Amino acid sequence: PGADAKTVQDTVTQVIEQNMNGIDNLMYMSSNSDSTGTVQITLTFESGTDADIAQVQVQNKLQLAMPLLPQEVQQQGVSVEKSSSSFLMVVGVINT
Amino acid sequence: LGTATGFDFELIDQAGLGHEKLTQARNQLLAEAAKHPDMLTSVRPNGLEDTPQFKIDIDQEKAQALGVSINDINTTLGAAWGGSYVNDFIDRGRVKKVYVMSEAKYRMLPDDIGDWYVRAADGQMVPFSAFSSSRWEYGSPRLERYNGLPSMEILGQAAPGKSTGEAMELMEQLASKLPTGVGYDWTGMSYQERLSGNQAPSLYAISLIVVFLCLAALYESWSIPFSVMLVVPLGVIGAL
Amino acid sequence: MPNFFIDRPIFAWVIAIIIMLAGGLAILKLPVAQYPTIAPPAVTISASYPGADAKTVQDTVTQVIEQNMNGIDNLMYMSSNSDSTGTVQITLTFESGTDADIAQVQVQNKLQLAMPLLPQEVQQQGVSVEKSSSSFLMVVGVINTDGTMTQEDISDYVAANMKDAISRTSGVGDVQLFGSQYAMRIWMNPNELNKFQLTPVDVITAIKAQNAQVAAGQLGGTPPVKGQQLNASIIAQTRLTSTEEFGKILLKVNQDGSRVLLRDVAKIELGGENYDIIAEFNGQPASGLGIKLATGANALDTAAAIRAELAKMEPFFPSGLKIVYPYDTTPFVKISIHEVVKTLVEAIILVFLVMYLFLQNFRATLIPTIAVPVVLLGTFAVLAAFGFSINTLTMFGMVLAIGLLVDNAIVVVENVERVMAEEGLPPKEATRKSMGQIQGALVGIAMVLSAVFVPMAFFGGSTGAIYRQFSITIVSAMALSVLVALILTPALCATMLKPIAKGDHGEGKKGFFGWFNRMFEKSTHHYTDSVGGILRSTGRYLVLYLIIVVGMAYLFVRLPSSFLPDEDQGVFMTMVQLPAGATQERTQKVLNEVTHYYLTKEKNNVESVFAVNGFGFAGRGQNTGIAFVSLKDWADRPGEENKVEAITMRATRAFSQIKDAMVFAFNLPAIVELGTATGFDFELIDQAGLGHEKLTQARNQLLAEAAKHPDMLTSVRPNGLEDTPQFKIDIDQEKAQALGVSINDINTTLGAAWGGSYVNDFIDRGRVKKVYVMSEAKYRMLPDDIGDWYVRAADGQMVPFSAFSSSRWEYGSPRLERYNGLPSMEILGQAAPGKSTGEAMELMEQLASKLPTGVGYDWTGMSYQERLSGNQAPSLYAISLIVVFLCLAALYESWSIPFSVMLVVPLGVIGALLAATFRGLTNDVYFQVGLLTTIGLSAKNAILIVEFAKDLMDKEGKGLIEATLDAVRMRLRPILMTSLAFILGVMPLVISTGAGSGAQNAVGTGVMGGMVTATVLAIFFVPVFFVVVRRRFSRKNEDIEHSH
Amino acid sequence: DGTMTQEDISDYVAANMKDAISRTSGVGDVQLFGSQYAMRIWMNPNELNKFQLTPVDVITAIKAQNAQVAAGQLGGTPPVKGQQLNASIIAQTRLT
Ligand SMILES: CCCCCCCCCCCCO[C@@H]1O[C@H](CO)[C@@H](O[C@H]2O[C@H](CO)[C@@H](O)[C@H](O)[C@H]2O)[C@H](O)[C@H]1O
């Protein structure tokens, strides 16, 4: 919260990236750090890789990098998730 | 997946170069790409341009002389202007966050900075303006990295009539003329071609060889299979 | 089938071709490895506590983690080292076949319960969980050939630009930097600190406050007021980037307004996170990456991927920077495999030549020959089908299978040839007649033969996977060659064989073939004459046979037994260990001596030496080091004296004359995680809170008692380090309270100055790196230096350490070991010459039962493996022999006639035993599988002999003796063709020098010896076997005529 | 033999048996029917009041005086060249 892109990159992104070692079947890794105080690191695995094993290996390497992150970032927590781009549907809720 | 005839290219800082030199190398690559409308079209950054930002320098000596601590100064600035997650409360049986932050009208403009006071050790309130100075500068609102190195993603496509393979070949050629320390890589749809497009030839070959061998077995003949294999273009011309 | 393809040769071809395409495609895609993986997965936990002594590490980290290690599937045991480098490694070792991914997941789920209980400084160093081999896959070295970069420069370059990408490469289980990344180093001066009434606590506070990255929000940030037109990020403090910026950190402003800057109380410089690891490549400054393979990953693929990654980095190197390859286990695998491929190709050429000697027409010799590549290539397809890899064992399976393969096609071609020499029938009809009489037998034989090889697919333990590689490869190839002989060979016979007129034996041919044919024909007659003779005696040969069986027994019980030969792999390692307390400088002196020896005394043999000071097999320390040695090619290192075993012996002997260090060169074992045989791995255990000193005393008593049994045990020794002097300092609580100095200030001042303290991060050329505060060297060298450090009391007074503390020398451990959660001390040793490992262990157990109360023991590693136990040989081969007899009984519809075939077994074994015995070889995996190969094939020769004889006595009239003679007459040529072709085919193996020639010699010698005696002897003894067994288990009336 | 009470027995099995049992083959979870020893400080509020102390002071002194300190080394790296002595500095250790 309230971090500029450089701050995000140099206290969060680089630290997580430096810890993404010893994970199987990684093809490549990319990230964005922006001035909305947000970072997303995406790791892409070989076709046929077990998506659950990929995710738990990532999340376990992250777990061990958490103590190296800023306190307020540890507070917000760092989400590790499977990446989909398709929704089955979007339910809107409005007040009229 | 793909933009069809599209490619997905990463410009990479391979040395100590930094965001500005990487941006200059990107602009150099983009200008050169633009000079080949015949081959390349719509090659462009995927990310964001540098923007003005407000640099504020805390004066350590003056803070120390006024008895104002750097932690008070920095949480005052950040909490007021950036907002700050304090802890949790319980709203109707669900745990939720508590945030402190300045009401909007006191964190809108540079003159507002001086309306925030910090308490010194001796009880006095010190306006932020007494121990800081500010200036405009440019910086990035979105920094990209690729395989752990600073990067800039570039999108584009083969010009009409041209193959994506052709368009990628030029991009590598243009990229080979960039400043020292600047490298590149293919990602996404492009990565899955420089690897997963070398296959088509050998798979079609296996198909054609096994077809011939099955036919030769059927007809007990090494030549008669040819009279069947010759049909292929007859359907294909009509589809085309 | 044979009839079908006799009419349809092109369909036959199409089947053969599809099989080869499938094999060919398997070969391009199949994993290649030296051996099947038989090593138990190991997960390692590593952590670091900067400036901690071994006990602090143990009681504050290691015990905490160990106590949370439970409910983990397939855990065999756990071991740990806590050392005065501040390092912990905990190794959890799992059952063979454990999914290493899940092992790692389950270990980490427990570890995360311990994590919050660990010291903060330990958590910030990052603890790691890895799943990899214990040994290095390769060492990637980096030098600067322009001398433009120091050791420290190169190390930082490597850490900052190369290591991470390599660390992320799939199959890379662990990466060790030989050197250290740069950190912002703040070297504190206690004199200057006291002059300005500051301490390391103030220095640390100032750095955290002034090397900061502040989140400051935005101008016009959401939610905004209405009408807002400006939106921009506020940028406040950012991480410092240079020594200059750190130097001007403001510590305080003096009473008269002057400033005290960080550079006024410290030297500030870019320097290593640590200064323990220093490497050289052939004497020059170097750094590097020691790379370990992730559990179960493919070594050749992982190495290819590492090279591809390094290739991406090279174009951006600073000037002079260069990658070198001082140590790589990879090449030997590729090379030794190709050497076997080469001998398989030579085998096919040799086969072609021997075929051309008996079949004297190019087209006719192509028939048996083409079978080889069809079968062999199809075997790769079957291996793919069953998830096997291309490895040393499957490749040698192919080779050992050559005789069994080629024999099916030879049996078919030869028999067709004879049918055309006996009756003058034309090719297409001759092969039909021929397939009619043998095809059933070929299929039957494939069944009995599978009984000799399938049982060893059921060996248990780690050893079993080895034998299963052979079993499946040989059974598959053998099954494929029967198929190939029923489909392709009959077709090729009916189309490519030259018509033979009746009664013709080419005796009236031209030059040499005409001569050869005349010799063979007369030899055949002199052959049949000889046998006809012995059949009239028989009693004589029955006795001679028992002689052979007895000698066979003799040789066998006196042939030593090994597992897999030790190969010269063109690389090896040298271990350097000085006593704890030794300095880095003395360790460098001993490394210089090691390096010197290889560069000057082994000029002709050693290509390079990558030596590292501060890293050893058991990990970081001032008193340890290692040298990685790469030899010149095997080709340029001719003779036994120039191979790894002779080199390492010479080297170790020369190094024994090095003062006050343990230095030895050793060749890496075939496996490793198998057991450098004769060796045992012992754990002494503190089972009752006895404590370190008592365990030591118990250890010493055991070591003493062991030494006085040199007949049984040799080199029984501790694996760890001896206690050393340590500086004990007591803080006086009352005095501190009285003076008003906080214990926290005291401890931080002490620890930061003498141990160093990781404060926070900074940005060095775009990359986040660490900032370290520590005393400059010259103020943390001497005991008296302690009192030059001052702490500030509450009332502002500077108080020297000497005012609130006292100190004394004492002894302590630099390396505390634990085994399965308890204090331990590992003890290594071996069986004395002539006595067995099991013997040595029982003695060790007997000695260990006499130690003081509360002291127990346990076996681990190689000694754990052998106690689940082996000795499954007798049973499995016993089953094998029974099933073979049962299969033969079905074949002959007789309970007795099988014995006439099975008696042939000793005749090849004796030749293999003689050959191995007098070449000084051993009873190992290659000897054993070779024996089954020889036995199978001569069993097969015997089967077709008595099958032919039995047919004569049954279908035709022919009495016993006549049938036997005409049967053996008919099967002499076919037998010789195969034997001579296989015996000559394996010459490449017996004559082999160079990469993997250890395995190749072991293979070839057994087979060649076995094959020669099997061929020469069975040709005479199988006739005896049949006539004697027929007579002994005779019914009522026969022999004298047989009706019709 | 009347030499161990229940609380003793429980400490013995917690401290010497439970860990190994819980790592034994096929064992999934292990419940101790009792409790391992801890060092028990049983405070008396009257005596605390008498000396004007609280549990806060007690807790503070225990963290300060029951400590295991990383204290560094003599002659550790990087050394002054020519250094002969390398030795661990041992400061406060845990009370026992
Ligand atoms: C007598 C006939 C049967 C005997 C011959 C059998 C040979 C068996 C030993 C082969 C060892 C396997 O070695 C294997 O070689 C092939 C061919 O270069 C490699 O194949 C590699 O190069 C080829 C092109 O040259 C590519 O199509 C392939 O994508 C690439 O991986 C494999 O990566 C390697 O693992």
Author numbering:
A (entry chain B): 50 to 145
B (entry chain B): 674 to 913
C (entry chain A): 1 to 1044
D (entry chain C): 146 to 241
From the paper:
The AcrA-AcrB-TolC complex is a secondary active antiport system in Escherichia coli, powered by the electrochemical proton gradient across the inner membrane of this Gram-negative bacterium. Its biological function is to capture cytotoxic compounds from either the periplasmic space or the inner membrane, and to expel them across the outer membrane, into the extracellular medium. AcrB is the inner-membrane component of the system, and is responsible for both substrate recognition and energy transduction. The asymmetric trimer structures indicate that this domain also cycles between three distinct conformations, and point to several ionizable residues in its core (D407, D408, K940 and R971) that might function as a proton-relay network.
